[PDB]
C-alpha cells in the first residue's frame, strides 16, 4: 500500500491499493496549457478530444476498457481505466495508439469532425457556464504576457488556425520521454513495474522539453464583461498563492479553509460557520462561497469566488470578506485553527482517497512530476498538526497584507466599485 518510484529512462510510479478493484494505467505528461504559446491555444484540447472520441470507439468495440483524460495547466492525464486482470491489454493499446502510430488517428476527416465538435463545445461553454468562465478570466488577467494566463480550452480564433502540422509539431516538441511518466493506480503490484520497460514499449521522440524563456509573474488587473442580460452576478478575488514544492503549501491551504465554503440555500450550512457567514446571513448578501488556493509549479493562486443574487449589495459582501481576511492576518482564535486543521484533514482524506482510481492516478502524476517523489498522506498528517497560529500569522503577513489583487467576473457586476474600494481596504487603517 506504499507508493514506489524509480528512474529508468521513463519514470514509473505505483500506488497499490487492493481496496478498490478498478485497475488503471496511463501516462501523465508534464506539459500542457502552460507549455504552449498564446497563438496556438487549443492544441491540447484538440489532442484530448481526438483521443477521447476515436480511441474510445476503438477500445470499447475491441476490448473492455473506458479511457478518460484531463488537462488542467500542464498535464495530459490520458488515464486508461481497466479491470484488475486486464492491464497488459490496456498498456499495449496505449503504446500502440497514442505515442505511435499517429497516422491511423489523424485522418483529415476525423480531425475535421473533432475540430467542429470542439468548436461547438467551447462555444456553448462560453455561452452557458459562468463560474468557470470567470475563473479562466481570472487566470488570463493575473498572468498577462506569460505562458500561464492562456486558458485550458482556447479561443475560437486560435482554434480555427491549425490543421495538422501545428498539432504534429507540438507532439514532437512535448511528447518526449524526459518529462513523461507512467502511472498505475489501481490494484496492480509489479506487472506494470516491469512491463513498461520492454523490448520496444517506449515513447518516441527522445530529447528534452524546450525550456520556456519566462516562467510566471503577477500584476493586479480587472477583466469584467458587464452585461445586464444575465440574471445573477459573478466575482472572483485573487491573491498570489504559494507554488508547489515550498514550505508554505499546507499553511496556505489552511489559511484558505478557515473561512470555508458556503451555500446559502442549505439548512445544514447557514447555522454553522464563522463570523462572516453570520454577519452575511443576518441580511441577504451572498449565495455561494469558494475559498480556493490553487498552486502550480511556477506560481499559485489564493482565490475567493462567489456568485451572488442580490445586485445592490455587492459592496457590502466585498467589504465584509476583506475585513475578515484582515482579521485572519491580525488575530485568530485557537479554536478556529483547530477546527480548520480537522476540516482540512478530512478534506484531504476524501480527495486523495476517493474510490475512483482516475483521480488518484492524476494526482500521483502531478506530484511525481512536480515534487519528484510522492508525499504519502501519513507525512502530511504528521506535518499538518504542527501548523500553529504564529506560522499562519507570519504567512498572512506576507501573502495577504497590502498585496495586489485581481478580479474578473461576467454578469451584472456594475455595482462593484472599480479598484480603490476593493484594494486599499485590506488593512482598515487600524491593525
Amino acid at each position: 500500500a506504499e507508493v514506489t518510484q524509480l528512474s529508468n529512462g521513463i519514470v514509473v510510479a505505483t500506488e497499490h491499493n487492493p481496496s478498490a478493484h478498478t485497475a488503471s494505467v496511463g501516462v501523465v505528461f508534464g506539459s500542457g496549457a502552460a507549455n504552449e504559446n498564446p497563438y496556438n491555444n487549443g492544441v491540447s484540447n484538440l489532442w484530448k478530444n481526438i483521443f477521447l472520441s476515436k480511441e474510445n470507439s476503438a477500445v470499447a468495440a475491441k476490448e473492455g476498457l473506458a479511457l478518460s483524460s484531463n488537462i488542467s495547466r500542464d498535464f495530459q492525464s490520458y488515464i486508461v481505466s481497466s479491470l484488475p486482470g486486464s492491464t497488459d491489454k490496456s498498456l499495449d493499446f496505449l503504446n500502440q495508439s497514442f505515442i505511435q502510430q499517429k497516422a491511423n488517428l489523424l485522418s483529415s476527416s476525423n480531425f475535421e469532425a473533432t475540430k467542429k465538435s470542439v468548436l461547438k463545445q467551447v462555444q456553448d461553454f462560453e455561452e452557458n457556464d459562468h463560474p468557470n468562465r470567470v475563473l479562466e478570466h481570472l487566470h488570463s488577467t493575473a498572468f498577462q504576457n506569460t505562458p500561464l494566463s492562456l486558458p485550458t480550452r482556447g479561443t475560437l480564433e486560435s482554434l480555427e488556425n491549425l490543421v495538422v502540422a501545428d498539432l504534429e509539431s507540438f507532439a514532437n516538441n512535448h511528447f518526449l520521454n524526459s518529462n513523461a511518466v507512467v502511472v498505475g493506480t489501481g490494484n496492480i503490484k509489479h506487472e506494470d513495474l516491469v512491463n513498461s520497460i520492454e523490448s520496444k514499449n517506449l515513447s518516441l521522440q527522445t530529447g528534452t522539453k524546450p525550456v520556456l524563456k519566462k516562467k510566471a509573474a503577477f500584476l493586479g488587473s480587472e477583466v469584467r464583461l458587464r452585461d445586464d442580460t444575465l440574471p445573477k452576478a459573478w466575482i472572483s478575488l485573487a491573491v498570489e498563492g504559494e507554488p508547489v514544492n515550498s514550505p508554505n503549501y499546507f499553511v496556505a491551504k489552511l489559511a484558505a479553509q478557515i473561512f470555508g465554503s458556503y451555500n446559502a440555500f442549505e439548512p445544514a450550512s447557514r447555522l454553522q460557520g464563522i463570523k462572516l457567514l453570520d454577519n452575511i446571513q443576518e441580511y441577504q448578501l451572498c449565495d455561494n462561497f469558494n475559498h480556493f488556493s490553487l498552486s502550480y509549479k511556477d506560481s499559485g493562486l489564493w482565490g475567493f469566488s462567489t456568485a451572488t443574487r442580490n445586485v445592490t449589495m455587492i459592496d457590502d459582501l466585498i467589504h465584509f470578506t476583506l475585513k475578515q481576511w484582515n482579521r485572519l492576518t491580525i488575530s485568530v482564535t485557537d479554536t478556529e485553527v483547530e477546527r480548520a486543521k480537522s476540516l482540512l484533514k478530512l478534506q484531504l482524506g476524501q480527495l486523495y482517497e476517493s474510490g475512483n482510481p482516475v483521480n488518484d492516478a492524476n494526482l500521483l502524476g502531478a506530484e511525481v512530476l512536480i515534487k519528484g517523489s510522492k508525499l504519502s498522506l501519513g507525512e502530511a498528517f504528521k506535518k499538518i498538526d504542527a501548523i500553529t497560529v504564529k506560522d499562519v500569522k507570519a504567512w498572512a503577513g506576507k501573502r495577504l497584507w497590502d498585496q495586489d489583487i485581481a478580479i474578473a467576473g461576467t454578469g451584472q457586476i456594475e455595482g462593484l466599485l472599480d479598484y480603490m474600494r476593493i484594494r486599499s481596504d485590506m488593512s482598515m487603517m487600524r491593525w
Binding site: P38, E136, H137, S140, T141, Q144, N145, S149, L150, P151, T155, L156, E157, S158, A217, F218, L219, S221, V223, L225, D402, D404
Partner: peptide, 24 residues
C-alpha cells in the same frame, strides 16, 4: 481578437522588476 488577449500595456507597465518595493 478574443477577449483573453490582453492589450499591450508594455508602454505603461513598470519595468521587469515586479512592484514589491514600489509600495514603499
Amino acid at each position: 481578437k478574443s477577449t483573453y488577449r490582453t492589450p499591450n500595456f508594455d508602454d505603461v507597465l513598470k519595468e521587469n522588476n515586479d512592484a514589491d518595493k514600489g509600495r514603499s
